[PDB]
Amino acid sequence: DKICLGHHAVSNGTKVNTLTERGVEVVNATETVERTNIPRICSKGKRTVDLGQCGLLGTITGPPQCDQFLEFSADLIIERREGSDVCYPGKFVNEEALRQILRESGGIDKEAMGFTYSGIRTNGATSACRRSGSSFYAEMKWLLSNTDNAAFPQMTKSYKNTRKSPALIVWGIHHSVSTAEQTKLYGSGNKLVTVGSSNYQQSFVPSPGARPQVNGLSGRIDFHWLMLNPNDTVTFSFNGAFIAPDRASFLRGKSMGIQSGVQVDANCEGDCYHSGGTIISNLPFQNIDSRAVGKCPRYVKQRSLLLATGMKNVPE
Amino acid sequence: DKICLGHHAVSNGTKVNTLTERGVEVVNATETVERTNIPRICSKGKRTVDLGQCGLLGTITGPPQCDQFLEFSADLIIERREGSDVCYPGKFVNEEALRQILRESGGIDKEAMGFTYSGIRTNGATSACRRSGSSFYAEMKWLLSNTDNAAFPQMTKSYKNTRKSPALIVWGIHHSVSTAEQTKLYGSGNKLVTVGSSNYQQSFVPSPGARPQVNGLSGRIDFHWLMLNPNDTVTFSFNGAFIAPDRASFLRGKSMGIQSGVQVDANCEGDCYHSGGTIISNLPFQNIDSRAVGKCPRYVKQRSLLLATGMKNVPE
Amino acid sequence: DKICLGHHAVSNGTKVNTLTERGVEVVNATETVERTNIPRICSKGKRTVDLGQCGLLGTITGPPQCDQFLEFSADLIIERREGSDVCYPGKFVNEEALRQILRESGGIDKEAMGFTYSGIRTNGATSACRRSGSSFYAEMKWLLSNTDNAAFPQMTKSYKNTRKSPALIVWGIHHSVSTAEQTKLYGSGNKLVTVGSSNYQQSFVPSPGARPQVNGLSGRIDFHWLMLNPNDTVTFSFNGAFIAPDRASFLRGKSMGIQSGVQVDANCEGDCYHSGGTIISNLPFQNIDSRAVGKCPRYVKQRSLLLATGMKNVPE
Amino acid sequence: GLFGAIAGFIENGWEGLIDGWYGFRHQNAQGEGTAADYKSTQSAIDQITGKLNRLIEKTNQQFELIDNEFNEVEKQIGNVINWTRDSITEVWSYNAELLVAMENQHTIDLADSEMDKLYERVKRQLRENAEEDGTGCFEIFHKCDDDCMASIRNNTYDHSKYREEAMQNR
Amino acid sequence: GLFGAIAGFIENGWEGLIDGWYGFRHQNAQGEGTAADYKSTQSAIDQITGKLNRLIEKTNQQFELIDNEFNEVEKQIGNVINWTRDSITEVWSYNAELLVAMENQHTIDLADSEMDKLYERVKRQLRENAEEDGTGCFEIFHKCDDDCMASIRNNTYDHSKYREEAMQNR
Amino acid sequence: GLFGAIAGFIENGWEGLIDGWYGFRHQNAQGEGTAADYKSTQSAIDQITGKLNRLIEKTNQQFELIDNEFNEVEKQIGNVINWTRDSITEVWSYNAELLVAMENQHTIDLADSEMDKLYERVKRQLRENAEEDGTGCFEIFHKCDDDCMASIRNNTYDHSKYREEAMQNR
Numbered sequence A, B, C: 001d002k003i004c005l006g007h008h009a010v011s012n013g014t015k016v017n018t019l020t021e022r023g024v025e026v027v028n029a030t031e032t033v034e035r036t037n038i039p040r041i042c043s044k045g046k047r048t049v050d051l052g053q054c055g056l057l058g059t060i061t062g063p064p065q066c067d068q069f070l071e072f073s074a075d076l077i078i079e080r081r082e083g084s085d086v087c088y089p090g091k092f093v094n095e096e097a098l099r100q101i102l103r104e105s106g107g108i109d110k111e112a113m114g115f116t117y118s119g120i121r122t123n124g125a126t127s128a129c130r131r132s133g134s135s136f137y138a139e140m141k142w143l144l145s146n147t148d149n150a151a152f153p154q155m156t157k158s159y160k161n162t163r164k165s166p167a168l169i170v171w172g173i174h175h176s177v178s179t180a181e182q183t184k185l186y187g188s189g190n191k192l193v194t195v196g197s198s199n200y201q202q203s204f205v206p207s208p209g210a211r212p213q214v215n216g217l218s219g220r221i222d223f224h225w226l227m228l229n230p231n232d233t234v235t236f237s238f239n240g241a242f243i244a245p246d247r248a249s250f251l252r253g254k255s256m257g258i259q260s261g262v263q264v265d266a267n268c269e270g271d272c273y274h275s276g277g278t279i280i281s282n283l284p285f286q287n288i289d290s291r292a293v294g295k296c297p298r299y300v301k302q303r304s305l306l307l308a309t310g311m312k313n314v315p316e
Numbered sequence D, E, F: 001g002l003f004g005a006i007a008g009f010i011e012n013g014w015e016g017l018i019d020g021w022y023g024f025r026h027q028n029a030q031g032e033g034t035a036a037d038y039k040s041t042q043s044a045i046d047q048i049t050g051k052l053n054r055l056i057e058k059t060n061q062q063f064e065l066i067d068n069e070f071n072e073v074e075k076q077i078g079n080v081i082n083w084t085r086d087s088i089t090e091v092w093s094y095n096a097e098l099l100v101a102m103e104n105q106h107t108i109d110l111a112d113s114e115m116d117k118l119y120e121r122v123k124r125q126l127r128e129n130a131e132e133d134g135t136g137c138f139e140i141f142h143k144c145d146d147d148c149m150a151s152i153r154n155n156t157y158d159h160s161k162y163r164e165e166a167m168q169n170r
C-alpha cells in the first residue's frame, strides 16, 4: 500500500552549539580544540642542541659550562632553567635582544679577532671560572696593567669584518669591589672605554663598589655587544677596566629556540613547542599554552568546540 | 470557499543591513553597539582608592599629599589630573612601568629597611615638602655630610628581603643647583652610587647644574627602583648625593587602576571604565572609547549596527 | 506538448572555493586580492617633499644637503636610501622616535632661540660640512673656549616656548678624537652638560677617544632632543663639549611619511604606499607588501581568492 | 528571502495580525475571520531569541592600561601601542559588520522558511480536497464552516470525510 | 546547492541562453523556442552585485610606519613589531579565506533558490492543467500555441480557460 | 532545520537504518522492508567531509619567542606584549566560536535539505499514481510488490505502466 522516507538516528548523540541554539543533539561530531599534550620535546629529524647548564649568551663568551657549545650548529635550540650565562658574576646589556638573535641564528661559528697587546697583562683569571684551577671566559681576555697600581696606557684597537655576514662583537666592563681595588689592577684616574661603529656610538665608564657575594665574589662584569656589518670597522679606546674579545661570532643560518623542562625525544616529531612539551595536532585551535611557539594551532580560551559531522539526532 | 496564509507587518519597521543589501526593512531590530555612557566611576562593592592630589608613585616615597596613602588597600585605584608624585622637584626613572605594577598591586604594605648610619647627617629637609614647616619625603631620608664641605665617607649598606614576595626598593639621587652646592652638602670629588641585585647591575653618578625653578626650586631628585626577589640581597655603595630608603613596599594582591576626571558613585556597578566614566552594557561592542579598560565590549568605529529580531517588513 | 525550465551555462567557467568544496566551477567570478603594483609614488594633488640626499633628521640641524629643507611643508614626505642626517659624523639619540614625529609633522617652521654668548667662540667649523669651504650645521653653533686650552666657563642658558604648540629642541655633544684634543677646544677637567624640562631630566658627560674615520674624520657628535611644551622653560648647564641650538622647530600640522626607491608621479593618485610604489585598488585585500602604509587593503598571504559572481556552471 | 514566500508568492503582510507572527485568514459561508499559528510563531521567536542570548554577552577578559592620558609615554613605544590598538580596532569593526550582516541574512531567510513550512503543512493536510491558488491561498471545494476551519488550524482536519465531495466538485 | 534544482533535478544549463540567467524553452505544435525570465534573472544579479558593493571597498583608516627599511630599529622592539604584524596577517588571511568561502556557498545556494522559485511560480500558474515531468519540465495536455506560451512567461496564463480541456485529457 | 523535514514533517529518525544516512522503508502485499539511498547519503557525507579537510589543517606560519619564562623581560615591554597576546587570544576565541556555530547551522540545514531533495525526487517519480500522506509517506493505490519498490529506489519506476490503474483507484 505505501512507501515511507526517513533518516538515521542513534541512542547516543553528541550535543553541539549553533547560531540559534545551545546544545542541539547531532548524530556525530568532532573536536576542534587540541588538549592533548606530549610531555617531551619532539626532535625527530632536527639538529638539536640542548644547552643544559650552558646559558645561551654564555656560548658567545665561554664560561666553562659552555665549553662544548662554543661553535654549535642547530635547527632547534633548547634553554634550561639550570642554565647560566656567566662564571664570573655579571650580566649582559640588552640581554633579551641578543637571546632572540641567537635563538634563530642556526648556531655560531667563531673567528679570531686578531688583537695583540703591549705594555699590559692579558691572562687575568678567577676562582669562579673553573678549568683545572682558576681560569676565565674562553672567548675573552681580562686585560690588566703589567704590575700593581701601574698606569694602564690609553689603547686603540680595531677590527674590520672582512666576511659577508654581520659580526657579533662582545666586550666586558669590570667593576672591581672597591675604588682601591680598581686602581690596583688598572692604575688610578677616571678610566674611559668607548665604541664606534657606522650605526653605533657609546661610552662606558666603570663603577667600583660593593655588590653582594655571588659565587662568593662581590665583583661584577658588564658584558656589551654590537652587530658589525660587512666591511665595517669597530674601534676600542680604553684606559682600563676592559674585558677584551678574543673571537667574534658569525651566525650560521636559521633555527628556532625554546625554553623547556622536559626531555628530548627523537622518536617523536612536532613543530609546535612550549615549556611542557610538544603539541602534535592538525586541529585549527589549541587550549594548552598561549605562549607555544613554532607552527601551531591558534590558542583559544575554550576547552572545547565540537563541530557537527552528522545530521540532527531525532530518535524515537 | 477558501483559506489564506499570511504573516504580520507593521507601518513602522526598522532598516538593517545584510550580506546582500543595505537598508532592508524588518519588523523589529536591536542595537549591538553601546553608546550610552555613565559619567561617574561606578564603584559599588569595590574597595576604592581615589588618589586625588596624591600621585601613584608618591605613595612609595611619601610627599605630604600622599601621607594618607602610604599603605593603602584596593580593588580599584583612581589617578587624577591634579595628582603629583613629588614635593621636592624630580622624577622617576622607568616611571610608567612602576605605575603599571602599582595599578594592579592591590595596594601596598610598608616595612622598615633597617638602615642605620654613622659619620653623617640623616634629617635633610626643604620648603617644597610642607608638614608644619619644612619636611621631606616620609619614606625616605636625605643623607648628608655632618658639616659643610665635609668628606662623605664611602658607605656600604645591605638589605635582605626575608619575605615571601618581591620587595619594591626605591632610592633617590640629588642633583644640586651647582658644582659648589654639591660639595657643600657631600664634600668635593666625583661621587659614585651603585646598585647590585641578582638580576640587576647599575651605577649612578650625579650631575649638578641649573634647572628651571619648579616650586621655586632649581634642584632635582632622580628616583630609581628595583624589585628585590625573596631571600635576595641588595647593596648600596655611595660617596654622596644619595636619598636613602627608610622603608620597602610589598604588594598586597590584585587590583585595577584607571585615570579619570569624574566622580565616584557607590550606587552604580560596572567593570568597564574610561576617563569619562563607566560603560554598563551587555552589548558585544561599544563606540565610546577605544582605551576603555576592565572587562569591556569590543571597541568598534561604527556608531551603530542593528541586528534583525524579526522577519522582513512587507506592508500594504 | 510541453514547457521546460533551465538556466545559463558556459564552456569556460571559473573555479572557486566554498565551505564545503575546493574548486567548484561557477559561471563568473572576481578577484579579492590585489597583486597589481604601480612602480611610482602617486602624488597627484599632494604637497610632496622628496628628501633625496637630505636625511629627515638633518632637516632639524641643517647639514648642507638639507639647506633647501630647513622649513619644508608637506602632506607627503619621502625618504631615500641615499639620504644622510649628518655632515660631521655622528648620530641621534632616540633617532627613530624623532623620525616618526617628523614623518607626520606636516613639515617644520623654524624660530631663533635667542642665545647669546660671552667669553667663548661661536663659529666652529669643519671640512666635512661643505659650503664654499668649511662650514657647520646651519641650525647649530659649535661652542668653544676663546683660545687653546682655555677654561670653558660654566654656562647657564634658558629658552621659554612662548608659542601655543610644543617646541622641538636639539643639541649636540662633541666627542673629540682624544683626551688631549678635548682639552684644547674646551679646557681640561670633567665637562658636564645637563638638561631640565618639566617632564625631562638628563645629564651628558663627554667621552673622547678614537673612532673609525668616517668622511675621513674620527670625531663624533651625539645629537639629542626634547619636546618643550607651551610656556615651559628649558635650561642648559655646560662646562664644554656642547653644540648649541640656534633655532627651534615647530610642527606645522599633519602629513604621512614613506620610504621608497621609485619616482614620484603627479599623474597618478593613491593613498596606499610601500617602497616599490603605490597600490591603487578597491579590493579589500592585497598580497604585495605587508608593511604598506597609508589607507590600504588588508595584507593577506594568499595570492588569490576568487569570489563567485554567478551560479554554478553545469554544462552539457 | 531564499524560500520565496515572504516578499515572494505571498504579496504582503497583515497589519491586523497582532496575535502572532504567522496565521490564517479564512473565507466561507459564514464570513471572513483571522487567527494566529502558535507553533510556527514560536519556532521563529525561539530561534531568534536564541541568537540574541548568544550575542548579547560580554567577555570576562580583563584588559589594563598600557599607556597614559596624563603623562605621555615614550614616543616609540607609544606609536607601537597606537598602531597595535588601531590594528585591533580594524579587526573588530570588520567582525561586527560581518557578524550582523550574515546574522540578518539568516534571520530573514529563517523567517521566510518558517512561513513556507507552515504553508506546506496545510497543503499536505488537505490533500486532493483543495488547490493551490498561488497567492498563498487554498481554494476549498467542499463547505468549510467555522468549525471546519478550526480543525485545520488545530491539525485535526480529516480529509477522508470530505474527499468524495471535493473530488466531485473539481 | 541547497534547493536541488541547479545541478539537481535539472540536468544541466543551456549555453544557448545568452539572453539572461534563467529562462524558458518550450515545445508545441509550432516547433521549439526559447526565452529569458527577466524577474528571476534580476533578483539574482541584484543580490550578487549587492554583495560586491559591500565587499569592494577600502577603509578610510590610516596606518603609519613603526619600523624602518633603511635603518633597522632596535632588535627587541623590532621583534615585538614583527610578531605583532605577523599575528595580524594570520587574522586577516583567515578572515579573507572564510569570507570568500561562506560568500560563495550562499551565492551558489541563492542562485539555486531563484531557479526553484521560478519553477514553483509556473507550477502554481498551471494548476491541474499540467504535470511535473521531473527533469524541470511541464507536460501540457491542452494545445499551447506560441501565443499560449507567451502568456505563461508574462504571468497572464488563465488556467480556467483550458481547465476542462486538460482535465479531460489526463 | 530550514527545510522542515528532519525534526519536521518527518516525525523521527530510524535507529534500524545502519545501512546509510537516508533511506526507504516500504509496506506492501509481501510485508515490510527497509533500505538505504546511496546517492543522498553520499552528497551529505561528501559535503561534510569537505568541511573537515578545509578546517582540519594547521598553518605553515612560524612564530618565535618574544618574552622569557626563566628571566622576565623589562616590565613595560612585557605589559605591551601580554596585552597584545591577550588581544589576539580574544580575536581567535571569538573566531573559533563563530566558525563552529555557523558551520553547525549550515551542516544541520544541509542534511535537512538532502532529505527534502530525496523526498521530492520520489514524489516527482510517482506523479499522479500516489499521494502525500504528510508524515513523509507515499500511499500507493496500485500494487507495488518488492520488485516494484526496488524500481523506485533505482530511479527506474515507469509511472505510465501503472497510471490507468492508480488513477481509477483514487
Ligand SMILES: CC(=O)N[C@@H]1[C@@H](O)[C@H](O[C@@H]2O[C@H](CO[C@]3(C(=O)O)C[C@H](O)[C@@H](NC(C)=O)[C@H]([C@H](O)[C@H](O)CO)O3)[C@H](O)[C@H](O)[C@H]2O)[C@@H](CO)O[C@H]1O
Pocket (backbone or CB within 6 Å): A124, A125, A126, A127, A128, A142, A175, A176, A177, A181, A185, A216, A217, A218, A219
Ligand atoms: C694570591 C693573592 O695575591 N692573594 C690571595 C687573596 O686574593 C685571597 O683572598 C681571596 O680572594 C679571592 C678573589 O681572588 C681572585 C678570584 O677572582 O678568585 C683571584 C684572581 O687572580 C684575581 N684576578 C685578577 C685578574 O685580579 C681576582 C680579582 O682580583 C677580583 O675578582 C676582582 O674583584 O680575585 C676571593 O675573594 C676569596 O673569597 C678570598 O678569600 C687569600 C685567601 O685565599 O689568599 C691570598 O694569597
Ligand SMILES: CC(=O)N[C@@H]1[C@@H](O)[C@H](O[C@@H]2O[C@H](CO[C@]3(C(=O)O)C[C@H](O)[C@@H](NC(C)=O)[C@H]([C@H](O)[C@H](O)CO)O3)[C@H](O)[C@H](O)[C@H]2O)[C@@H](CO)O[C@H]1O
Pocket (backbone or CB within 6 Å): B124, B125, B126, B127, B128, B142, B175, B176, B177, B181, B185, B216, B217, B218, B219
Ligand atoms: C638657613 C640658611 O642657612 N640659609 C637661608 C637660605 O637658604 C635662604 O635662601 C632660600 O633658600 C631656599 C632653599 O632652602 C632649602 C630648601 O629646600 O627650602 C633649605 C633646606 O634646608 C636645604 N636642605 C638641605 C638638605 O640642604 C635645601 C637644599 O640646600 C637645596 O634645596 C639643594 O638644592 O634648601 C630657596 O632656594 C629660597 O628661594 C631661597 O630664598 C635665605 C632666604 O630665606 O635665608 C638664609 O638664611
Ligand SMILES: CC(=O)N[C@@H]1[C@@H](O)[C@H](O[C@@H]2O[C@H](CO[C@]3(C(=O)O)C[C@H](O)[C@@H](NC(C)=O)[C@H]([C@H](O)[C@H](O)CO)O3)[C@H](O)[C@H](O)[C@H]2O)[C@@H](CO)O[C@H]1O
Pocket (backbone or CB within 6 Å): C124, C125, C126, C127, C128, C142, C175, C176, C177, C181, C185, C216, C217, C218, C219
Ligand atoms: C689649520 C690648523 O690649525 N691645522 C691644520 C690641521 O688640522 C690639518 O690636519 C687635518 O685636520 C683635519 C681636521 O680639521 C678640522 C676639520 O674638521 O676639518 C678643522 C676644523 O677647523 C676643526 N674645528 C674645530 C671647531 O676645532 C676640526 C676639529 O678640530 C676636529 O674635527 C675635532 O675632532 O678639525 C682632518 O683631520 C685632516 O684629515 C687632517 O689632515 C693639516 C693638514 O691640512 O693642516 C694644519 O694646518
Ligand SMILES: *[C@@H]1O[C@H](CO)[C@@H](O[C@@H]2O[C@H](CO)[C@@H](O)[C@H](O)[C@H]2NC(C)=O)[C@H](O)[C@H]1NC(C)=O
Pocket (backbone or CB within 6 Å): D068, D069, D074, D075, D076, D078, D079, D082
Ligand atoms: C596615540 O593616540 C592618542 C589618542 O588615542 C594620542 O593622544 C591624543 O593626542 C591628541 C592630539 O595630539 C590630543 O588632542 C588628545 O588629548 C590625545 N588623546 C589621548 C587619549 O591621549 C597620542 O598622541 C598618540 N601617541 C603618539 C605617540 O603620538
Ligand SMILES: *[C@@H]1O[C@H](CO)[C@@H](O[C@@H]2O[C@H](CO)[C@@H](O)[C@H](O)[C@H]2NC(C)=O)[C@H](O)[C@H]1NC(C)=O
Pocket (backbone or CB within 6 Å): E068, E069, E074, E075, E076, E078, E079, E082
Ligand atoms: C622583521 O622582519 C623584516 C622583514 O619584514 C626583516 O627585514 C628583512 O630581513 C631580511 C633578512 O634579514 C632582508 O633580506 C630584508 O632586506 C629585510 N626586509 C625588510 C623589509 O626590512 C627584519 O630583519 C625583521 N626584524 C628583526 C628584528 O629581525
Ligand SMILES: *[C@@H]1O[C@H](CO)[C@@H](O[C@@H]2O[C@H](CO)[C@@H](O)[C@H](O)[C@H]2NC(C)=O)[C@H](O)[C@H]1NC(C)=O
Pocket (backbone or CB within 6 Å): F068, F069, F074, F075, F076, F078, F079, F082
Ligand atoms: C605576562 O603574563 C605572564 C603569564 O602569561 C606573567 O607571568 C606569570 O606570572 C605569574 C604570577 O606573577 C606566575 O605564577 C607565572 O609563573 C608566570 N607565567 C609565565 C609563563 O611566565 C607575567 O608576569 C606577565 N608580565 C608582566 C610584565 O606582568
Ligand SMILES: *[C@@H]1O[C@H](CO)[C@@H](O)[C@H](O)[C@H]1NC(C)=O
Pocket (backbone or CB within 6 Å): A012, A013, A014
Ligand atoms: C554516550 O552514553 C554514555 C552513557 O553511559 C555517556 O556516559 C557518554 O558520555 C556518551 N558519549 C557520547 C555521546 O559520545
Ligand SMILES: *[C@@H]1O[C@H](CO)[C@@H](O)[C@H](O)[C@H]1NC(C)=O
Pocket (backbone or CB within 6 Å): A028, A029, A030, A031, A309
Ligand atoms: C564520528 O566522528 C569521529 C571524529 O571524532 C570519527 O573518528 C568517527 O569515524 C565517526 N564515526 C562515525 C560512525 O561516523
Ligand SMILES: *[C@@H]1O[C@H](CO)[C@@H](O)[C@H](O)[C@H]1NC(C)=O
Pocket (backbone or CB within 6 Å): A230, A231
Ligand atoms: C667589501 O669590500 C670588498 C673590497 O675588499 C669588496 O670586494 C666587497 O664587494 C665589499 N662588500 C660589500 C657588501 O660592501
Ligand SMILES: *[C@@H]1O[C@H](CO)[C@@H](O)[C@H](O)[C@H]1NC(C)=O
Pocket (backbone or CB within 6 Å): B012, B013, B014
Ligand atoms: C517610526 O516612525 C516615526 C515617524 O514619525 C519616525 O520618526 C521614527 O524614526 C520611526 N522609528 C522607528 C521605526 O523605530
Ligand SMILES: *[C@@H]1O[C@H](CO)[C@@H](O)[C@H](O)[C@H]1NC(C)=O
Pocket (backbone or CB within 6 Å): B028, B029, B030, B031, B309
Ligand atoms: C523589539 O526589540 C526591542 C529591542 O530593541 C525590544 O526591547 C522589544 O521588546 C521588541 N518589541 C517587540 C514588539 O517585539
Ligand SMILES: *[C@@H]1O[C@H](CO)[C@@H](O)[C@H](O)[C@H]1NC(C)=O
Pocket (backbone or CB within 6 Å): B230, B231
Ligand atoms: C628563603 O630562605 C629561607 C631560609 O632562611 C627558607 O626557609 C625559604 O624556603 C627560602 N625561600 C625561597 C623562596 O627561596
Ligand SMILES: *[C@@H]1O[C@H](CO)[C@@H](O)[C@H](O)[C@H]1NC(C)=O
Pocket (backbone or CB within 6 Å): C012, C013, C014
Ligand atoms: C578559459 O579557457 C582557456 C582555454 O585556452 C584557458 O586557457 C583559460 O585559463 C580560461 N580562462 C577563464 C575560465 O577565465
Ligand SMILES: *[C@@H]1O[C@H](CO)[C@@H](O)[C@H](O)[C@H]1NC(C)=O
Pocket (backbone or CB within 6 Å): C028, C029, C030, C031, C309
Ligand atoms: C564577470 O566578472 C568580471 C569581474 O572579474 C566583470 O568585469 C565582468 O563584467 C563579468 N562578465 C560577465 C559576462 O558577467
Ligand SMILES: *[C@@H]1O[C@H](CO)[C@@H](O)[C@H](O)[C@H]1NC(C)=O
Pocket (backbone or CB within 6 Å): C230, C231
Ligand atoms: C601661557 O602663558 C600666557 C601668559 O603669558 C597665557 O596667556 C596663556 O594662556 C598660557 N597658555 C597655556 C597653554 O598655558
